[PDB]
Amino acid sequence: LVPVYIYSPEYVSMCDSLAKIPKRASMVHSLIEAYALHKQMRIVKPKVASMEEMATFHTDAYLQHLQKVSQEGDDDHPDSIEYGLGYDCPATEGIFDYAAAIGGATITAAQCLIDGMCKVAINWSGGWHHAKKDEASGFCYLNDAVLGILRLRRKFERILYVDLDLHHGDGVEDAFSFTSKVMTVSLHKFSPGFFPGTGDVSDVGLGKGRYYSVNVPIQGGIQDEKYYQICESVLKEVYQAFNPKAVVLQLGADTIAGDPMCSFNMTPVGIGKCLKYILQWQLATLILGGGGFNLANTARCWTYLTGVILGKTLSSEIPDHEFFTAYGPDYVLEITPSCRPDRNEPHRIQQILNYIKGNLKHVV
């Protein structure tokens, strides 16, 4: 009944070392601790993924390359472009150990769910959904979401993956493109030039997986009410058509107002309504993080969502803690949306929803 929280001090220190999000893991954990939420959870130490575990998805050649460049942090290896290492995914010293740690944490959370230790297991430092079997991408070196789904598959016949990160969950969608046993649903910004460039509403998967990929392309400036209306509409239809046995939910906070990417205009309350809708299904649920580049806001978001999972109302005042001085200028838990336009036209959203409904008739 009590949610599992994947945590150890060593794991947070490892996750803190990614240069695209330095110290973020510590900020998220410190805020959760400051609100005393960890006392309401079952704290489980993550295992480190073995080569065999990582190889359930990633190719041997890619894993061996990552291991090789990780030794000295060789960021100029002849084969690195081929393997997606470069500006977004640099070959830093020890990056293999980092990858193995996050892969292992999501696998540990999935195992907790299989064993019935909990109905909800949380790995806020996971969710690296862009990585491909043989290629790093989008700050992701190992696709822990795919590894977690593959572990859950041992017990759960149909798994629903829901991806609320700002960016299209392309690595997870591609991994499961050809199967009807895992349905992927991504809501994301979709615009020419915007990473990774995929995920139009017409992208529905392939072969036996046709219609078991769902993409909801959204324009800039979306706020809580409209986002929740879209998310609820799609998830209601998906749940009815697909009848999942377990859910993996990626909650990247790069949609939240104040993110330097400045694309969506969401608050944690809106994402929380989506989370509540999914929790009401009462299925085994693996909760992951993902993007989020305003570090204090990402901690605000994931702390608030941890409160949602626990059914608790948190104080609006950020408690004093290690990183309190980073919570200005308001020092409150709530995030105020920016005063910019929502570029989502109601007719286009209607069209997208109609198209998705038509696709889901084939799953039914």
Place this chain on the structure above:
Amino acid sequence: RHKKX
């Protein structure tokens, strides 16, 4: 290939 970032 797009850049993220």
